[PDB]
């Protein structure tokens, strides 16, 4: 259960990113824009799995593309959350095997939606209701990502955020640490000294993404999502990124700058 | 309001097509397969519109690809309907303009899903609740196709069928007449005399799709969806196709062959 405080802090980070680019961003957007964007990225993830039962295919998805898609969904869902302040869900479970062992005699055509889980209230929903790991299994992924579309459709952005963070952990990616590292790099890229070549890397020739990876590799998801100290760990990741990219002391921001 | 009798007859036509290819097709499939397929085809339709508000794009979708996608959805939704015998919907309306004229003072961040229409029961739902025409307008299309995904997610296949038939009419395509014509051609293609070149076209050199178009061009949607006489009109379309493709009298089937 990802703390609502942590979820709110991530959304404030995203508001920061969005506000730098356009101070009036919220006025130009609607909640439905972010729902659509989530739905489209979830569809892209779905389509990379071998779901088409009538084709002779295929290789499971590229893990790097999956990570990119999860990261993209996170940006959309954090942006969505900034525009919101009983709604029932009818979730898919992973594709079932035929009824057997003497239960096949009540396996008749049922009311539409019988295969869906019992109605779950959106405000009572947890991950175990709608995400199925591991995502290496096709049917688990198909149910999970369809469920993400269901939640995006109800504008349940915090649940979507939680879900993609968990999905990322499942495939070995610490999306919270990555998000905070990349957030910092976004600010560095707008600095005069970055743009003019004054600020240089701690290791010449190493690509930005490999540098970020080095900054975040010591941290597990649990390490950066404790309700008590997450701000400190995110500040540590910020500092690590500033160091790696050669930012002078006086140009750095603390985590408290971004958090309300 | 498309008659439930007509919807059932279309689904029986589809069961016919599916049963020819695999007599045990239903045992291999689940309702969720068809929901997924619908969702993926709706996503493809969505992605062909210029929805990405951060890109300098683009030309509205290709009308022929739209027609193909609607036709594909119809096959999936008719197949879905054959596997089923209160569920709430929260539909999108087309993207709103900002609140004004002195209502802007209650435009505050609201409970998630506030922009969605009031809950509509799936069994009370009509087209006017979720489809917005014309589909030449981007925001109308985006709301409509997202709503189709909502209904596919609840396995409301008959509503999906109705919706794509109406969508097809909106862009000038009689999808019912086309479906029946193509259904007939599917059977002709499995006939010995077709496969061996014995059965020849009424006009040499004309492509199959242009021939089908000639068979169906006299019919409006209303012409082929009257509860009283639709079977007769579908039989007339079958006969027209058999004639155009050179089928001997004794190899033809009547509409009553397919309908239960």
PDB file of C-alpha atoms in Angstrom, chain A residues 146-238:
ATOM      1  CA  UNK A 146      -6.997  -3.639 -19.184  1.00  0.00           C
ATOM      2  CA  UNK A 147      -7.721  -2.883 -15.573  1.00  0.00           C
ATOM      3  CA  UNK A 148      -5.439   0.181 -15.722  1.00  0.00           C
ATOM      4  CA  UNK A 149      -7.582   1.399 -18.660  1.00  0.00           C
ATOM      5  CA  UNK A 150     -10.681   0.845 -16.489  1.00  0.00           C
ATOM      6  CA  UNK A 151      -9.181   2.992 -13.740  1.00  0.00           C
ATOM      7  CA  UNK A 152      -7.941   5.696 -16.161  1.00  0.00           C
ATOM      8  CA  UNK A 153     -11.526   5.778 -17.522  1.00  0.00           C
ATOM      9  CA  UNK A 154     -12.853   6.581 -13.999  1.00  0.00           C
ATOM     10  CA  UNK A 155     -10.068   9.174 -13.528  1.00  0.00           C
ATOM     11  CA  UNK A 156      -8.588   7.159 -10.656  1.00  0.00           C
ATOM     12  CA  UNK A 157      -5.138   8.521 -11.241  1.00  0.00           C
ATOM     13  CA  UNK A 158      -3.580   7.719  -7.836  1.00  0.00           C
ATOM     14  CA  UNK A 159      -4.444   4.047  -8.308  1.00  0.00           C
ATOM     15  CA  UNK A 160      -2.919   4.143 -11.761  1.00  0.00           C
ATOM     16  CA  UNK A 161       0.287   5.641 -10.263  1.00  0.00           C
ATOM     17  CA  UNK A 162       0.455   2.944  -7.615  1.00  0.00           C
ATOM     18  CA  UNK A 163      -0.111   0.293 -10.226  1.00  0.00           C
ATOM     19  CA  UNK A 164       2.628   1.371 -12.618  1.00  0.00           C
ATOM     20  CA  UNK A 165       5.083   1.754  -9.711  1.00  0.00           C
ATOM     21  CA  UNK A 166       4.299  -1.851  -8.675  1.00  0.00           C
ATOM     22  CA  UNK A 167       4.484  -3.026 -12.284  1.00  0.00           C
ATOM     23  CA  UNK A 168       7.887  -1.404 -12.636  1.00  0.00           C
ATOM     24  CA  UNK A 169       9.145  -3.135  -9.459  1.00  0.00           C
ATOM     25  CA  UNK A 170       7.874  -6.432 -10.859  1.00  0.00           C
ATOM     26  CA  UNK A 171      10.169  -6.096 -13.947  1.00  0.00           C
ATOM     27  CA  UNK A 172      13.101  -4.847 -11.789  1.00  0.00           C
ATOM     28  CA  UNK A 173      12.845  -1.066 -12.277  1.00  0.00           C
ATOM     29  CA  UNK A 174      12.668   1.401  -9.373  1.00  0.00           C
ATOM     30  CA  UNK A 175      10.362   3.897 -10.955  1.00  0.00           C
ATOM     31  CA  UNK A 176      10.135   6.198  -7.915  1.00  0.00           C
ATOM     32  CA  UNK A 177      13.930   6.613  -7.745  1.00  0.00           C
ATOM     33  CA  UNK A 178      14.125   6.994 -11.493  1.00  0.00           C
ATOM     34  CA  UNK A 179      11.356   9.618 -11.494  1.00  0.00           C
ATOM     35  CA  UNK A 180      13.099  11.716  -8.848  1.00  0.00           C
ATOM     36  CA  UNK A 181      16.509  11.409 -10.629  1.00  0.00           C
ATOM     37  CA  UNK A 182      15.008  12.383 -13.976  1.00  0.00           C
ATOM     38  CA  UNK A 183      13.063  15.223 -12.345  1.00  0.00           C
ATOM     39  CA  UNK A 184      16.376  16.625 -11.136  1.00  0.00           C
ATOM     40  CA  UNK A 185      18.021  16.227 -14.560  1.00  0.00           C
ATOM     41  CA  UNK A 186      15.084  18.110 -16.116  1.00  0.00           C
ATOM     42  CA  UNK A 187      15.922  21.121 -13.929  1.00  0.00           C
ATOM     43  CA  UNK A 188      19.644  20.851 -14.621  1.00  0.00           C
ATOM     44  CA  UNK A 189      18.963  20.927 -18.401  1.00  0.00           C
ATOM     45  CA  UNK A 190      17.339  24.357 -18.025  1.00  0.00           C
ATOM     46  CA  UNK A 191      20.336  25.856 -16.190  1.00  0.00           C
ATOM     47  CA  UNK A 192      22.476  28.427 -17.941  1.00  0.00           C
ATOM     48  CA  UNK A 193      25.649  26.581 -17.003  1.00  0.00           C
ATOM     49  CA  UNK A 194      24.376  23.285 -18.354  1.00  0.00           C
ATOM     50  CA  UNK A 195      23.322  24.815 -21.682  1.00  0.00           C
ATOM     51  CA  UNK A 196      26.595  26.652 -22.184  1.00  0.00           C
ATOM     52  CA  UNK A 197      28.821  23.654 -21.374  1.00  0.00           C
ATOM     53  CA  UNK A 198      30.194  25.050 -18.069  1.00  0.00           C
ATOM     54  CA  UNK A 199      28.726  22.218 -16.012  1.00  0.00           C
ATOM     55  CA  UNK A 200      30.406  18.925 -16.845  1.00  0.00           C
ATOM     56  CA  UNK A 201      29.920  15.275 -15.853  1.00  0.00           C
ATOM     57  CA  UNK A 202      31.843  13.446 -13.147  1.00  0.00           C
ATOM     58  CA  UNK A 203      32.797  10.844 -15.744  1.00  0.00           C
ATOM     59  CA  UNK A 204      33.399  12.127 -19.251  1.00  0.00           C
ATOM     60  CA  UNK A 205      31.749  10.246 -22.118  1.00  0.00           C
ATOM     61  CA  UNK A 206      29.129   8.389 -20.035  1.00  0.00           C
ATOM     62  CA  UNK A 207      25.578   8.840 -21.406  1.00  0.00           C
ATOM     63  CA  UNK A 208      22.969  10.646 -19.243  1.00  0.00           C
ATOM     64  CA  UNK A 209      20.855   7.558 -18.621  1.00  0.00           C
ATOM     65  CA  UNK A 210      23.826   5.481 -17.420  1.00  0.00           C
ATOM     66  CA  UNK A 211      24.733   8.344 -15.077  1.00  0.00           C
ATOM     67  CA  UNK A 212      21.214   8.443 -13.654  1.00  0.00           C
ATOM     68  CA  UNK A 213      21.317   4.676 -13.213  1.00  0.00           C
ATOM     69  CA  UNK A 214      24.442   4.971 -11.117  1.00  0.00           C
ATOM     70  CA  UNK A 215      22.736   7.578  -8.960  1.00  0.00           C
ATOM     71  CA  UNK A 216      19.745   5.348  -8.204  1.00  0.00           C
ATOM     72  CA  UNK A 217      21.194   1.805  -8.228  1.00  0.00           C
ATOM     73  CA  UNK A 218      21.762   1.648  -4.443  1.00  0.00           C
ATOM     74  CA  UNK A 219      18.040   2.177  -3.727  1.00  0.00           C
ATOM     75  CA  UNK A 220      15.238  -0.347  -3.608  1.00  0.00           C
ATOM     76  CA  UNK A 221      11.620   0.707  -3.989  1.00  0.00           C
ATOM     77  CA  UNK A 222      11.058   0.178  -0.245  1.00  0.00           C
ATOM     78  CA  UNK A 223      14.153   2.338   0.448  1.00  0.00           C
ATOM     79  CA  UNK A 224      12.486   5.359  -1.226  1.00  0.00           C
ATOM     80  CA  UNK A 225       8.851   4.892  -0.207  1.00  0.00           C
ATOM     81  CA  UNK A 226       8.910   4.882   3.583  1.00  0.00           C
ATOM     82  CA  UNK A 227       6.356   7.400   4.950  1.00  0.00           C
ATOM     83  CA  UNK A 228       8.827   8.590   7.584  1.00  0.00           C
ATOM     84  CA  UNK A 229      11.896   9.391   5.504  1.00  0.00           C
ATOM     85  CA  UNK A 230      11.080   9.375   1.798  1.00  0.00           C
ATOM     86  CA  UNK A 231      11.757  13.113   1.452  1.00  0.00           C
ATOM     87  CA  UNK A 232      15.271  12.574   2.755  1.00  0.00           C
ATOM     88  CA  UNK A 233      15.911   9.760   0.291  1.00  0.00           C
ATOM     89  CA  UNK A 234      14.566  11.788  -2.585  1.00  0.00           C
ATOM     90  CA  UNK A 235      16.799  14.700  -1.513  1.00  0.00           C
ATOM     91  CA  UNK A 236      19.749  12.260  -1.478  1.00  0.00           C
ATOM     92  CA  UNK A 237      18.904  11.167  -5.050  1.00  0.00           C
ATOM     93  CA  UNK A 238      18.657  14.850  -6.111  1.00  0.00           C
TER      94      UNK A 238
END
